[PDB]
Structure formats: structure tokens, C-alpha cells
Paper text:
AMP-activated protein kinase (AMPK) plays an important role in regulating energy homeostasis in eukaryotic cells. AMPK is a heterotrimeric enzyme complex composed of a catalytic α-subunit, together with β- and γ-regulatory subunits. The α-subunit contains an N-terminal protein kinase domain and a C-terminal regulatory domain. The γ-subunit contains four copies of a cystathionine-β-synthase domain27, and we previously showed that the γ-subunit binds three molecules of adenine nucleotide.
The first of these to be reported was A-769662. Initial attempts at co-crystallisation with A-769662 were unsuccessful likely because of the relatively weak binding, poor solubility and the presence of additional, non-specific, binding sites that promote protein aggregation. Utilizing the crystallization conditions for 991, we were able to refine conditions that gave crystals of AMPK in complex with A-769662. The two activator complex structures therefore confirm the interpretation of our functional and binding data that A-769662 and 991 activate AMPK through binding to the same site at the interface of the kinase domain and CBM. While there was no CD change upon binding of A-769662, this compound competed for the binding of 991 to AMPK.
Numbering used by the authors:
A (entry chain C): 10 to 295, 322 to 346, 363 to 376, 396 to 473, 532 to 551
B (entry chain D): 78 to 173, 189D, 190D, 191D, 192D, 193D, 194D, 195D, ...
C (entry chain F): 27 to 121, 128 to 324
Write the structure that this text describes.
Amino acid sequence: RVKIGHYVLGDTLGVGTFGKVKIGEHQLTGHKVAVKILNRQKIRSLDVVGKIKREIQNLKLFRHPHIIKLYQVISTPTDFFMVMEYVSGGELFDYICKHGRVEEMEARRLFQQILSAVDYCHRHMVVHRDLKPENVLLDAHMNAKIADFGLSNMMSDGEFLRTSCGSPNYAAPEVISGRLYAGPEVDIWSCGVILYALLCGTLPFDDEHVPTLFKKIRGGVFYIPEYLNRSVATLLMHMLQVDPLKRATIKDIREHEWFKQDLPSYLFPEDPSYDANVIDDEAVKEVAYHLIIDNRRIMNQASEFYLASSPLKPHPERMPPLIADAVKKAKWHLGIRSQSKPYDIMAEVYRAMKQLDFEWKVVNAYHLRVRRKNPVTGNYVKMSLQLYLVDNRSYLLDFKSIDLGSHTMDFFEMCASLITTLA
Amino acid sequence: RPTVFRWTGGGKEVYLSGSFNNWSKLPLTRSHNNFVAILDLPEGEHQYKFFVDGQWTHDPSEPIVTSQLGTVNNIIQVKKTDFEVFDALMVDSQKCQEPYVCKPPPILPPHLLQVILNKDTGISCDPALLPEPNHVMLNHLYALSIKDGVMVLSATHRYKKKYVTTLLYKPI
Amino acid sequence: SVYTSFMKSHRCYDLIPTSSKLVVFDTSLQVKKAFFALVTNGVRAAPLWDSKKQSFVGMLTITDFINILHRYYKSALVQIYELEEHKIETWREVYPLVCISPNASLFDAVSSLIRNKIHRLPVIDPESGNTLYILTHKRILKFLKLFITEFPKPEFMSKSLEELQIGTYANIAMVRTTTPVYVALGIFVQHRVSALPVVDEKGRVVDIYSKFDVINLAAEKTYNNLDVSVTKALQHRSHYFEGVLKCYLHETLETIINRLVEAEVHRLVVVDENDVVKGIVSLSDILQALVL
Ligand SMILES: N#Cc1c(O)c2c(-c3ccc(-c4ccccc4O)cc3)csc2[nH]c1=O
Ligand SMILES: Nc1ncnc2c1ncn2[C@@H]1O[C@H](COP(=O)(O)O)[C@@H](O)[C@H]1O
Ligand SMILES: Nc1ncnc2c1ncn2[C@@H]1O[C@H](COP(=O)(O)O)[C@@H](O)[C@H]1O
């Protein structure tokens, strides 16, 4: 008879992307919990030992009404027990199957809660890359419950993601192509199809042949039924845009007319009922609570004092255009370019570091982590080099900074010395 | 201080005997293919062994020991650092420079092409103001075409919860 | 009263905009290029970085551009060799860094602005050594404006300007409508004032010539002919945006502060019953009165 900390284990609810989740009932009371079980032997061979640590440190700090809460994590000499919140409504995928489609009155509500949960994750630099109606759980009151992170990852400043994970469907065009992506724009794409599957009942990109399926996704062409109104139609085409730069963001969706209707004001950070119903980020820093919170809302609602606008009265300090020798404004470009062989470029930057005395380690055939010691301050100035591919017969060398004088200036002076001594 | 004894082999019924049971046989509960039993064991080394369908058998993967008489049983070492999550991950991460090179390509991500210094801000706000930069364009160097011997560099860094795009006019 | 205890609470960090642009010059940069760079980047002033000693040494502002012009200007027939040849490092020889931590109070900011008689203060993070933002008077007063309805209103805000005696009302530096720019630039150097109200023969203010209107000589590259009148230099904006701006001695302080933050200018011209001058209430005058 299996007991793990007052909880008795029962039937398996299912096996996730990592680990087996099974229901647990309190021995004395009957309180139901879901216990995800992680084998310690699986973890070391996958080298995900550091990735489980990250997911645990983040899931225990999460607190959203539409995300499965983690109550505690029990450690055993052979396995880890992640006891968490239990819901009885089952998968959303099974709810879309029970009914034909979902009424837009209810489909809107479920979509809002889900995107709320997504937003919360992106604000904590966590991107859940396995968003699907199989991972959206339901409770007794038909509320959304995002779960099964596993394929989730953190977002660092100036760092892209590489891993092509998720279902064949629901996956962004740049994921199935194995390209580099930012993070958030992928979760919006999986939410687009989730919105489609919620309303239509079927999938926008579906084919028995997997190569032909990827062809449809990259093509980004899907059938829009006529029982979908003009309003919600525009939103879907915006969320499922192929080019990630044209694709909608969470702020874009939140301003959409179909989304703003019947929207509860407790779901989003700058909504009227948020500053009084949700404990924010001033909890860790601290009449004192209300005073600090009030200070932020004043600074927040002054969007023209902290953030620039986009194309009234001209600002007094606005500069006139510099006259001829008006001149055409110069354009800024990324790093430096070349059209020679990739091997020639790396062979050229290698001899370039000899003349400047750079110490460096090789992480990849196109990723160098260089380092120079500042002769004046004594500090070490290091940066990141990465050769990319542009168009067809074009290349680009990228420069990235790594954390008595000034670090920003040190990064600039080190780049300039390398750029000058490089053809 | 729990401890998980799982039997992965086949069988209609599996027992567990060890020093804890005084080598008596403890009935294991069955799932689909797993025979498991969680006990409360102190810190140290404990000798255990399974009994499946009639024959004394041990788990091949688990470390063994010989009691100077041919008897071979499994050995589990219940450490004190097995009951703390991070202290167990530390022992699982600890158990898991300046080169000259040697040299024995990814497509450019379209996000780094959104130059922040090339977009207008509308003649309504302070000239020093800029739009909020993407988190992935941070720390990346942007430059201009050199004109009359002066090189101009720029990058967007982050301090606390703010963003400063610094430009450096530097003659060469 | 409660205004002083306010600025002792808020750090300088609360003034820094979420995203901003910070031009920086190397000391070895040719000074002429540095002045053009200020025009192209839309920035009013830039921190100076001495590459040799690896530390910020000061600021380059439009005042420096006025100093260079006034010091070396023979005529419109001969070019200004030094302005074309000098470097930032070399000019600083012919003519200490004042900064502040972002974690320092907003009260220390206003204090450091007055004690050092400067208009722009470089906010430098002591942790990373990097420069973050350039603090000004317009930035500070506009910040307090966001909280004049949060922090209770003291008694003096309802008082007239004549009662509070705020600003300068003696020996007001002015220029004529036909006053050459060089002569105007000389007034900027001698009396060290931010702006010079322009007056006609009748004695009324027709226009105002600030220090900001001088870089327009570097923008249009008309800096080699300083013999032209001050009106000719204000012709580029004479057709649009104006303007004028002024106040009275009977107007309340609150009405005046509201007038400054709205027009986003540094000063008002205190006129009489007509358009003739009577005094100048500056932003440095108001901030000084809400600290002492
Ligand atoms: N997949 C998987 C998996 C487990 O089931 C367990 C188990 C386990 C085995 C069986 C049971 C069980 C036993 C009787 C009835 C129901 C059960 O879920 C509970 C937990 C303990 S550690 C572990 N590690 C795993 O990777
Ligand atoms: N045109 C002017 N003539 C005389 N004094 C002035 C003038 N403009 C400003 N002031 C005074 O100079 C001091 C600093 O002002 P500002 O240079 O505008 O910060 C204050 O005492 C002002 O009242
Ligand atoms: N009282 C005023 N009336 C009209 N224009 C002004 C006034 N004060 C400043 N300006 C203008 O505001 C711009 C910035 O000057 P400053 O306020 O000195 O930074 C310049 O174009 C000035 O001519």
C-alpha cells in the first residue's frame, strides 16, 4: 500500500513530457492532489539536472489562478515527488470533443484566462513551449489550468532559443524549421491555433503526411469558416502570421475588440481591478504597501514621461535637420558584414585577435567567447562573437557584451579595436 | 525520510527482504509492470534483496556486495543529502579555457534587424526618449558607415528595469 | 514643507525613463564633429569619456559651443581655424566631474544642481560605472507635477509671485532686436544666463533668444557669420510654433509652475501691464524655493 507523506497514490492520470503524473488522496481527509513523479536516474543521463532545478525554483514562486499550483516537492533517494493542485474537469481537448465546438461566449472566456496565464509566464521570463488543449486543464467551475511545463525554458537578455519542441501541430513556423526564436512569439502562435480549435473544433494545419503538414504551417494558409465573424477573424490571422515580426503580441491581443468584450478586470496587470486584487512585485521590496503601489501607478499612467510615442505640438528641444554638407539620415546596421567564405571569415577574425592579444574559448565553429584585460583598470573585458547567415551569399558577424571605468565603454572600445583591424 | 524500492522486472508477485525486515518478506503493491514499496529508512547502508515467483533475486543495476560466503545482495546508501531537493541536485550536478585555437552556420534571427535607432518617435515627446527594446536585442552592437575618419558605435543595455541606448562617437 | 520630504524619499532612478538614448563623446574626438553629432542625434549634451584614464571627465554642452565661438571669431571673412582643428581634449586645456548615483535621493539632485550652478547632471551607476541618464530641471519639476495631487498642497502655492519674491528682478540681461549674435554670445559668457529676451525700440519683448537657439548655427552651418542680427538667427522658427510665453506678478505660484511644465521651457518672462519686462522667473529659481 503506497503512501507518500500522508498521501495515498492511486491511478495514473497520465504521463507528461517528463515524468508520470498520478492522483493522490489524503489518508485522513480525502483531499485529492496530483503527484508528478521524476526518476533520479533519468535526470543525470539527460544532463537536465540543472533544468529541473530551474523549473522547480520557478514553479514554486508562480501564483496564478489559471496555472496549476505546486504545493510541495518531496525528495527520495531514487525519485522526486512533485505534489500539486488537482482538477477534476479533465483536459480541454476532451471538452472540445464532447461538445462540437465551443460557444464564442464561453470560448472567449476560456481564451482570456489562458492568455492571462501565458502573460504571467512571459512576465517572469518563462516561456511554455508546449501550449495545447491537452495541456489546458479544467476544474469544477470550467476554469483554465495551464500545466505540464517540461518543454518550458527561461529567457535571457540577448539570448535566443534553439530547441525545436512541442507537438507537430500548435508549433510556430520557426520551430518546425529549427531556426532561432525569441520565445514569446511562439506561445502566441500556439494560442492562435488553440483559439481556432476552440471555435472551429478542428485544427487549422492538419495532414496525415508530416512533411506535408510542415508545408502547410510554413505556408500559413488556413480555411476560415463563415460562421466566424469579421472581428474574431482578424485576430486569428494576426496571431497565426508566419513572419514572427508581423505576428501579434499579448499587448496587441489585449487591445483587440473581440478580446476586450466581457473581459474581467482581475486578469491583467494594468487593469482597474488588478492593483487592488493581486499582490505585485512590491512585496519583496517592502501604509507602506499602499504608498509604494500608488507611486508606481502614477509613474505607469504617465506613458509619455517614461516611453516614447510613435507617428501635434512639437517638443521645444526638437532639433532641426542638419543642413547639406537637408541631408539624408544615416541608417544603423547590425554588427559587420561580408560576402566571403565562412571559413575565411573565422580565419580572418582569428589572426585579428593575435594582433590585439585576445584570450578566448571556442564554444562553436561560429561562436567565440573572447576576453581582453584592460591595461588601465585591471578589469577583464569579455564579449560574445557569433557568425550568422543573411540572404543567400551574405554573412554577418554579431557582437554581444558579457557581464573603475565603465563596462559599456569597455565593450565599445574592445569592439572598435577588433572592427578596425578586420579589413 | 522515505526510500523507494522499485522492482522493474517481471513477475506475478514480488516480495522484499532486508535487514529492516529481519529478512522477512514484505508484499509489494503492483501497478502495470512496477512493484514498489516506500519505507522509512535511517541514514547509512542497508542490505536488501527481492523475491520473485519463488527464486531469491537481486536487481542487476544496483551495486552489490559479497558477505564472504557467496551470498550477493544489493546495497543502497541512504545519505543525509538525499532528502533535500537542491542538495540532491548538487550531488547530481557534481556527479554529472584561454585557448589559442585551432578550428577543426546559423541563420540570422530577424529580431536583431529591428534597429531601434532607425525608427521615428513622433515630434510630440522628448528627443531622448525611445520605444521599449526587445529583450533579445540587448547587448548587441550596432554601427554606422564611417564618414571622415570617425566611427560611431551603439548598443542597448539594461540597468535595473530601465533601458539605455548609448552612442559612442569615436575617431579612428 | 511636504515638498522637501517628498524629494528626500524618491531616488534619481524614478526620473530615468524606461528607454532613453545617451550620446557619449571620446575626449580625442574633434570638437567640431562632436557639435554636429549633437544636432544629428537630437541630444542637447553628451558625457565625455577620457580613454586614457578610463573615466568620465565631464559634459559637453551648447554652452561650450558658445564659448568656442565667442573666444575665437575674427570675422566672416576668415574661418575659425581652432573650431575646425581643436579636439575635445585640447579645448578643455584652454578653457572636476559633478555627477550623482541613481540610488541617491532626488533632494540631493536638486541640491547638486544649485551648488554647482549646472543645468544638466550625469546620473552614473557606481556599481557598473556606466552613465545612465542626464538629469535636468525640466525633468525634476515635471516629476513633482505628477504628484502635486498626491502629496497635499502647501500654503505658498496659492500665493502670488510678488509676495513670494521668487526670481530675478534686477539687472535683466536682454538683447535688442538688431543685436548681432556675437554680442549676444558675449552676454551669455559674461552674465552666465540661460536666455536673453529680445526687445524692440519700444521696449517690448518680441522674441526670446535661449542658449538652445545657438546650435542652429551649427545645424544650418551659419556659425561663421556671427555678424547677423539676433532676429536673423531666430528666423528659422519665426514662422512656426511661436510662442512668446510670459507671466504676471499677481499670478499664483501654482499657475506659474503649471505654465512651465506645460510649455516645457526653462523660464518665463515676468512682464508688467504691457509687454515690457519686469523680471525673470527661472526653473532654477522655483526648484531653489522648494528646497530651502
Ligand atoms: N513512469 C514512472 C515512475 C513511477 O510509476 C514511479 C513510482 C510508482 C510506482 C507505482 C505506483 C503505484 C502502485 C500501486 C498502485 C498505484 C500506483 O500508482 C506509484 C508510484 C515510484 S518512483 C517512480 N518513478 C517513475 O519514473
Ligand atoms: N535674461 C536674464 N537676465 C538676468 N538674469 C537672469 C536672466 N535669465 C535668468 N536669470 C537669472 O539667472 C539665474 C539662473 O537662471 P537660469 O540660467 O535660467 O537657470 C536665476 O537667478 C535667474 O533669475
Ligand atoms: N519663455 C519662453 N518663451 C518662448 N520660448 C521659450 C521660452 N523659454 C524657452 N523657450 C524656447 O524653448 C527652447 C529651449 O530653450 P530652454 O528652455 O533654454 O532649453 C528654445 O527654442 C527657446 O527659445
